[PDB]
Amino acid sequence: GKIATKYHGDIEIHEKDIVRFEQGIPGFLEEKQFVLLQLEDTPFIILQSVNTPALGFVLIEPFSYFPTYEIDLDDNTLEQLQITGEQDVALYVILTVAFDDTTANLQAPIVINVHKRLGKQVILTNTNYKTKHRLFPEKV
Numbered sequence: 460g461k462i463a464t465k466y467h468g469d470i471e472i473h474e475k476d477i478v479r480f481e482q483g484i485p486g487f488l489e490e491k492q493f494v495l496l497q498l499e500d501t502p503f504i505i506l507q508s509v510n511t512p513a514l515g516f517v518l519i520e521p522f523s524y525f526p527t528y529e530i531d532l533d534d535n536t537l538e539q540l541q542i543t544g545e546q547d548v549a550l551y552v553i554l555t556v557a558f559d560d561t562t563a564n565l566q567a568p569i570v571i572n573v574h575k576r577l578g579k580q581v582i583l584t585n586t587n588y589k590t591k592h593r594l595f596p597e598k599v
């Protein structure tokens with residue numbers, strides 16, 4: 460199919476490219492189909508809705524900015540994403556771009572079972588992670 464996008468103009472996509480979010484994303488419970496679009500030659504990846512051109516979240520791989528970031532997925536999350544055995548899992552965090560005052564949501568990363576093409580925004584428990592971590596400490 461052919462879709463319009465927030466940052467990429469009109470593009471062709473294939474069913475193979477679509478990541479299904481069976482629960483949508485919080486605040487967007489009805490948005491169950493996304494594609495991942497690199498920007499390009501930047502580290503940013505857009506989580507672009509296949510049904511709503513204006514909905515595109517700005518993602519980064521978190522170790523770009525937070526080298527000590529560490530995540531543990533619980534069983535119920537593995538079951539909801541049907542993650543078993545040798546299947547591969549991709550990990551991202553959503554950026555709120557303010558480039559100076561930007562924050563990343565480390566509490567609630569985007570987790571994708573690439574092989575089953577399923578995703579979810581996972582809410583981490585019993586961590587010190589917050590929904591806004593500054594990319595740049597205020598000291599610089």
